[PDB]
Amino acid sequence: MIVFVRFNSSHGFPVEVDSDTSIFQLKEVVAKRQGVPADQLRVIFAGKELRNDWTVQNCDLDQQSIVHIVQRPWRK
Numbered sequence: 001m002i003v004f005v006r007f008n009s010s011h012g013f014p015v016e017v018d019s020d021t022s023i024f025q026l027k028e029v030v031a032k033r034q035g036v037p038a039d040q041l042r043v044i045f046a047g048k049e050l051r052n053d054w055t056v057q058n059c060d061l062d063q064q065s066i067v068h069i070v071q072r073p074w075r076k
Helices: 023-033
Strands: 002-007 011-015 042-045 064-070
Touching (some): 002 023, 023 042, 023 064
Parallel strands (some): 002 064
Antiparallel strands (some): 042 064
16 A cells, blocks of 8 residues: 655655555554654545545545645654
8 A cells, every 4th residue: 555645735755555544544654754743633635534434445545545644744
């Protein structure tokens, strides 16, 4: 599973994992590699906000999906 992790900004990074998967899962992959917490903020995919079975793979995901994450920003 490889999904692009996008932050609420014009900036997206390719992630090799399902990014919309359950709120715990999605937030984990993003926020973990996002240089941020895990599930602090909110994560989204294909316009559908973090839904365990409605937004993730059980939602409508392909091998190469793109998820829009709104994770907590990094503080240098």
